Amino acid sequence: PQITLWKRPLVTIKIGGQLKEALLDTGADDTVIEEMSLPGRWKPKMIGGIGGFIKVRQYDQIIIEICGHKAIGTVLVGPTPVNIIGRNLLTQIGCTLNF
Amino acid sequence: PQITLWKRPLVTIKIGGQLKEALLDTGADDTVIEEMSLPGRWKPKMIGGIGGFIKVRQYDQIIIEICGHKAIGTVLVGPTPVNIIGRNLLTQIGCTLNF
Ligand SMILES: NC(=O)c1ccc(S(=O)(=O)N(Cc2ccc(C(F)(F)F)cc2)[C@H]2CNC[C@@H]2NCc2ccc(C(F)(F)F)cc2)cc1
Numbered sequence: 001p002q003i004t005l006w007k008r009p010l011v012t013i014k015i016g017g018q019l020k021e022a023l024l025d026t027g028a029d030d031t032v033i034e035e036m037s038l039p040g041r042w043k044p045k046m047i048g049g050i051g052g053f054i055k056v057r058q059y060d061q062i063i064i065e066i067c068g069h070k071a072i073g074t075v076l077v078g079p080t081p082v083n084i085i086g087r088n089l090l091t092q093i094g095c096t097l098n099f
Numbered sequence: 100p101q102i103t104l105w106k107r108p109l110v111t112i113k114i115g116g117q118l119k120e121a122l123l124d125t126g127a128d129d130t131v132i133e134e135m136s137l138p139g140r141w142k143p144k145m146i147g148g149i150g151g152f153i154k155v156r157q158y159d160q161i162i163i164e165i166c167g168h169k170a171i172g173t174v175l176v177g178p179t180p181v182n183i184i185g186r187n188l189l190t191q192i193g194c195t196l197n198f
């Protein structure tokens with residue numbers, strides 16, 4: 001699809017057997033999801049931006065379905081105000097910016 | 100152009116006659132630039148980031164060129180990790196997400 005930017009580019013994703021709404025975010029290096037359970041090992045990480053930093057759990061090799069495109073990669077889990085699909089997964093679905 | 104996301108989508112902007120580096124950020128509603136002098140009056144604005152909300156200065160109808168594309172619009176000034184070109188100007192220059 002082609003998604004314009006008049007409003008936030010929210011899409012439905014499937015992760016850990018749950019459906020969630022997430023923002024396609026070219027400014028985010030990493031994918032960050034609200035508190036949820038994921039399988040496997042994790043390690044702590046700090047991420048930040050305007051407003052400050054939050055602590056998240058880093059899970060690797062997690063599968064996510066984004067608009068019917070399956071991708072695998074690292075997912076950070078923590079108290080983010082919005083679910084964010086970052087570049088590490090956007091690349092995998094072939095997402096580009098065009099103008 | 101078409102910009103992939105394997106690295107940060109950093110571009111050159113021109114504002115106040117000066118060249119600066121900025122991030123094309125579809126996850127940002129607004130355009131936020133590091134401290135600099137802009138003309139005219141400003142209004143208060145609260146923007147929410149990953150780690151909380153902060154106050155920034157809102158300037159309207161500011162001339163700004165983004166990757167050679169001329170735009171005129173709202174620019175916020177405040178403590179941001181990098182200069183951010185958000186949806187308000189991405190929309191102006193005709194930028195879309197595609198996959
Ligand atoms: N309203 C508005 O315009 C606005 C809203 C939010 C922000 S934001 O929170 O600062 N912000 C932009 C951002 C840009 C660049 C950087 C930095 F360079 F440091 F990596 C950090 C943050 C948000 C907006 N889009 C990307 C970033 N998302 C939160 C985030 C932060 C860090 C990660 C990580 F590190 F895991 F990848 C993942 C997600 C900026 C502007």
Ligand SMILES: [Cl-]
Nearest residue numbers: 072073074088
């Ligand atoms: Cl990854």
Ligand SMILES: [Cl-]
Nearest residue numbers: 142143144154
């Ligand atoms: Cl104020």
Ligand SMILES: [Cl-]
Nearest residue numbers: 172173187188
């Ligand atoms: Cl604007």
